[PDB]
Scaffold this active site. Structure first.
Site, short mmCIF file in Angstrom:
data_model
loop_
_atom_site.label_atom_id
_atom_site.label_comp_id
_atom_site.label_asym_id
_atom_site.label_seq_id
_atom_site.Cartn_x
_atom_site.Cartn_y
_atom_site.Cartn_z
CD1 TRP A 5 -2.49 -2.07 1.40
CD2 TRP A 5 -3.05 -0.64 -0.29
NE1 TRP A 5 -3.71 -2.49 0.70
CE2 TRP A 5 -3.98 -1.79 -0.25
CE3 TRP A 5 -3.27 0.51 -1.16
CZ2 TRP A 5 -5.10 -1.79 -1.29
CZ3 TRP A 5 -4.33 0.50 -2.16
CH2 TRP A 5 -5.22 -0.73 -2.27
CB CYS A 160 -11.78 -14.35 -1.75
SG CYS A 160 -11.92 -15.71 -0.83
CB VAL A 161 -6.17 -15.10 -1.15
CG1 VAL A 161 -5.22 -16.24 -1.26
CG2 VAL A 161 -5.91 -14.21 -2.36
CE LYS A 168 1.69 -20.29 0.33
NZ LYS A 168 3.25 -20.45 0.75
NE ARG A 169 3.14 -8.87 0.08
CZ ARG A 169 3.00 -7.95 1.19
NH1 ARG A 169 2.49 -8.30 2.12
NH2 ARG A 169 2.85 -6.92 0.33
CG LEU A 170 -1.83 -15.45 -4.91
CD1 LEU A 170 -2.90 -16.47 -4.65
CD2 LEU A 170 -1.49 -15.21 -6.35
CB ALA A 171 -4.08 -9.92 -1.47
CG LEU A 411 -24.45 -4.95 -2.91
CD1 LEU A 411 -24.93 -5.53 -4.50
CD2 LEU A 411 -25.61 -4.83 -2.03
C1 LIG Z 1 -8.66 2.52 -10.70
C2 LIG Z 1 -8.90 1.00 -10.32
C3 LIG Z 1 -8.56 0.55 -9.10
C4 LIG Z 1 -9.05 -0.91 -8.54
C5 LIG Z 1 -8.23 -1.38 -7.06
C6 LIG Z 1 -8.66 -0.62 -6.22
C7 LIG Z 1 -8.16 -1.23 -4.54
C8 LIG Z 1 -8.79 -2.42 -4.27
C9 LIG Z 1 -8.16 -2.94 -2.96
C10 LIG Z 1 -8.78 -4.01 -2.27
C11 LIG Z 1 -10.27 -4.01 -1.95
C12 LIG Z 1 -10.85 -5.08 -1.14
C13 LIG Z 1 -12.28 -5.03 -0.79
C14 LIG Z 1 -12.66 -6.30 -0.10
O1 LIG Z 1 -12.88 -6.99 -0.86
S1 LIG Z 1 -12.64 -6.50 1.41
C15 LIG Z 1 -12.99 -8.03 2.20
C16 LIG Z 1 -11.34 -8.80 1.75
N1 LIG Z 1 -11.63 -10.40 1.93
C17 LIG Z 1 -11.45 -11.10 3.04
O2 LIG Z 1 -11.35 -10.64 3.99
C18 LIG Z 1 -11.50 -12.55 2.73
C19 LIG Z 1 -10.66 -13.53 3.60
N2 LIG Z 1 -9.29 -12.99 3.37
C20 LIG Z 1 -8.55 -13.15 2.24
O3 LIG Z 1 -9.23 -13.62 1.37
C21 LIG Z 1 -7.39 -12.89 2.34
O4 LIG Z 1 -6.79 -12.67 3.54
C22 LIG Z 1 -6.95 -11.51 1.60
C23 LIG Z 1 -7.40 -11.47 0.14
C24 LIG Z 1 -7.94 -10.28 2.42
C25 LIG Z 1 -5.55 -10.93 1.58
O5 LIG Z 1 -4.67 -12.00 1.26
P1 LIG Z 1 -3.52 -12.70 2.01
O6 LIG Z 1 -4.08 -12.53 3.65
O7 LIG Z 1 -3.09 -13.76 1.51
O8 LIG Z 1 -2.48 -11.34 2.22
P2 LIG Z 1 -1.36 -11.37 0.96
O9 LIG Z 1 0.03 -11.91 1.46
O10 LIG Z 1 -2.07 -11.77 -0.33
O11 LIG Z 1 -1.39 -9.55 0.79
C26 LIG Z 1 -0.83 -8.81 1.83
C27 LIG Z 1 -1.31 -7.39 1.62
O12 LIG Z 1 -2.41 -7.27 1.39
C28 LIG Z 1 -3.15 -6.43 2.01
N3 LIG Z 1 -4.50 -6.47 2.53
C29 LIG Z 1 -5.21 -7.40 3.37
N4 LIG Z 1 -6.37 -7.36 3.56
C30 LIG Z 1 -6.58 -6.65 2.56
C31 LIG Z 1 -7.87 -5.94 2.08
N5 LIG Z 1 -8.93 -6.58 2.61
N6 LIG Z 1 -8.04 -5.03 1.28
C32 LIG Z 1 -6.81 -4.57 0.52
N7 LIG Z 1 -5.54 -5.03 0.91
C33 LIG Z 1 -5.50 -5.85 2.01
C34 LIG Z 1 -2.22 -6.08 3.37
O13 LIG Z 1 -2.28 -5.09 3.95
C35 LIG Z 1 -0.84 -6.42 2.48
O14 LIG Z 1 -0.51 -5.17 1.97
P3 LIG Z 1 0.80 -4.57 2.75
O15 LIG Z 1 0.31 -4.35 4.15
O16 LIG Z 1 2.09 -5.38 2.86
O17 LIG Z 1 0.98 -3.20 2.26
#
Ligand SMILES: CCCCCCCCCCCCCC(=O)SCCNC(=O)CCNC(=O)[C@H](O)C(C)(C)COP(=O)(O)OP(=O)(O)OC[C@H]1O[C@@H](n2cnc3c(N)ncnc32)[C@H](O)[C@@H]1OP(=O)(O)O
Length: 411
Positions: A5, A160-161, A168-171, A411
């Site tokens: 971020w 969702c991952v 594993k930094r997929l998000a 939603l």
């Molecule tokens: C112009 C167009 C733009 C479009 C894009 C706009 C932006 C959209 C952004 C997304 C909007 C989403 C809105 C929704 O859907 S919010 C709901 C999110 N989903 C869940 O909570 C479901 C259950 N959890 C998971 O599936 C995983 O734990 C997720 C996918 C959440 C993280 O996967 P994982 O646990 O395997 O981690 P990593 O190693 O891959 O990644 C680590 C990095 O991820 C950052 N992180 C963690 N949680 C979130 C989160 N909720 N939003 C944004 N970033 C998040 C974290 O600070 C770190 O970055 P940094 O701290 O190192 O910097």
């Protein structure tokens, strides 16, 4: 220390956000030509996949990923169980862009491993009214009004991952690839929500919950017995009485919304939403999409007096999987959606929502304190939840605002 971020066009600290006084972009302008044409590289065992949201089998694959791997509570007792019909509804609004739905699957067995969704929304996201008042005092009204025109942006959800591939930094790669496809469409801002704190929300609202079936909610440990009720011989009995609702709605004139109601519902809804600083702008087609009743998904009622629709409310259904309760496997939650009251006090309109939801078998009515939701919390016996919903923009500096200035339901 946010490794991902900190590289992104979002405000990096609360202090920075507290100093923002005008809405506008973070990044300097880019063109589509500046944006890489090819999807980002990923591990050679994985591949990018764009689901076909009109295919029952692709919706079913997304459904199962989210069912098993999407948002859980902190104690891992509940997990969202968005239905297939809900997902097709949320993911396919009018003029949705299929390429904005981004997935990663395993090449070998085609298993879906990660997902993120974007849909178009037209959003008013100009400088808040009060900041404009102050800007006018300073002679900066022009700067504060620069971005008042509604903007065609991306709303992101369903990140969702798979539980097996976490941390594993997929998000980040998913978010980057979504940003790329959206930018390639000449769209440069997004709006998203999360229940966790990231850099940096422009607003945050607490969840509130209105018990409809308090016995079940206590049994599954959604709710507890409030301490004040321990003075009773049968606390649960008195809790049931406290939350008891009439069996029928109180408003003469209440009925289910019909397609013929769309123009009037659009008019009263937009009149209401236009009074908030951040809010969507809906066409007839979007009002029809987001509010017309859909079995088991969205429930919408209007109040008609003298052959005119004067009020309406809507709620949508998301059940949660109950993990490890001997007697229940599902929590049936109704979520307050959009509404508009012109003829009656809002608490009287939302009382009929609670009554309708209870009669249709819902266990609890949930909401965030956006819109005017905070104003009826005490009146209708909502309790504060453990969780907050934070609102964010991507590539948009925005002054901190209260959740009661936010009119976008996510939603
Ligand atoms: C112009 C167009 C733009 C479009 C894009 C706009 C932006 C959209 C952004 C997304 C909007 C989403 C809105 C929704 O859907 S919010 C709901 C999110 N989903 C869940 O909570 C479901 C259950 N959890 C998971 O599936 C995983 O734990 C997720 C996918 C959440 C993280 O996967 P994982 O646990 O395997 O981690 P990593 O190693 O891959 O990644 C680590 C990095 O991820 C950052 N992180 C963690 N949680 C979130 C989160 N909720 N939003 C944004 N970033 C998040 C974290 O600070 C770190 O970055 P940094 O701290 O190192 O910097």
């Amino acid at each position: 220390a946010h490794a991902f971020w900190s590289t992104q066009p979002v405000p990096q600290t609360e202090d920075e956000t507290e100093k923002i006084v005008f809405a506008g972009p973070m990044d300097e302008p880019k063109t589509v030509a500046d944006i890489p044409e090819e999807p980002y590289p990923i591990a050679s065992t994985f591949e990018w996949w764009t689901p076909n949201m009109e295919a029952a089998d692709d919706i079913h694959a997304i459904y199962e990923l989210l069912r098993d791997n999407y948002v859980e509570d902190d104690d891992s007792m509940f997990r969202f169980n968005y239905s297939e019909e809900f997902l097709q509804w949320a993911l396919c609004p009018p003029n949705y862009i299929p390429d904005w739905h981004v997935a990663v699957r395993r090449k070998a067995d085609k298993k879906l491993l990660a997902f993120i969704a974007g849909v178009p929304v037209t959003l008013r996201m100009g400088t808040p009214k009060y900041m404009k008042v102050k800007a006018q005092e300073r002679g900066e009204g022009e700067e504060a009004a620069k971005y008042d025109e509604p903007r065609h942006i991306c709303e992101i959800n369903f990140l969702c991952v798979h539980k097996q591939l976490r941390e594993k930094r997929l998000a980040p790669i998913l978010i980057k690839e979504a940003t790329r496809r959206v930018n390639r469409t000449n769209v440069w801002q997004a709006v998203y929500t999360a229940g966790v704190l990231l850099p940096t929300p422009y607003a945050s609202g607490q969840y509130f919950h209105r018990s409809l079936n308090p016995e079940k909610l206590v049994e599954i440990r959604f709710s507890g017995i409030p301490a004040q009720y321990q003075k009773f011989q049968n606390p649960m009995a008195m809790l049931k009485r406290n939350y008891q609702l009439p069996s029928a709605p109180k408003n003469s004139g209440l009925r289910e919304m019909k397609p013929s109601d769309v123009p009037q519902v659009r008019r009263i809804l937009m009149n209401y939403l236009d009074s908030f600083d951040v809010g969507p702008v809906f066409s007839d087609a979007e009002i029809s999409h987001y509010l017309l009743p859909r079995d088991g998904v969205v429930f919408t009622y209007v109040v008609e007096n003298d052959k005119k629709v004067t009020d309406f409310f809507s709620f949508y259904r998301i059940p949660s999987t109950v993990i490890g309760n001997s007697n229940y496997n599902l929590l049936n939650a109704a979520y307050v959606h959009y509404y508009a009251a012109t003829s009656i006090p809002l608490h009287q309109l939302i009382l009929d929502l609670l009554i309708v939801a209870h009669s249709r078998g819902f266990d609890v009515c949930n909401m965030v304190e956006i819109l005017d939701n905070r104003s009826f919390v005490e009146q209708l016996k909502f309790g504060a939840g453990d969780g907050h919903l934070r609102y964010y923009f991507y590539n948009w500096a925005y002054p901190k605002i209260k959740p009661s200035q936010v009119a976008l339901v996510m939603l």
